[PDB]
Amino acid sequence: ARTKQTARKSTGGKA
Amino acid sequence: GPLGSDTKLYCICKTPYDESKFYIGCDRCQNWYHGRCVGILQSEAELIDEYVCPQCQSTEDA
Give the technique used to solve this structure: NMR
C-alpha span between B59 and B3 (Å, rounded): 31
B1-62, what's its fold? Answer: Herpes Virus-1 (3.30.40)
Contact B39, B45 (CB under 8 A): no
C-alpha torsion sign, points B30, A6, A1, B58: negative
C-alpha torsion sign, points A5, A10, A11, A13: negative
C-alpha span between B20 and B26 (Å, rounded): 19
Give, in order, the Cα–Cα distances in Å from B17 to each of A9, A12, B5, B26, B49: 17, 24, 19, 15, 20
Structural domain boundaries in chain B: 1-62
How many Cβ pairs within 8 Å bridge chains A and B?
36
DSSP B59: H
Answer whether A10 touches B (CB < 8 Å): no
Taking contacts as CB-CB distances below 8 angstroms, the residues of chain B near A2 are 24-27, 30, 32
Contact B38, B53 (CB under 8 A): yes
C-alpha span between A9 and B52 (Å, rounded): 26
Quick check: helix, strand or coil at residue B29? coil
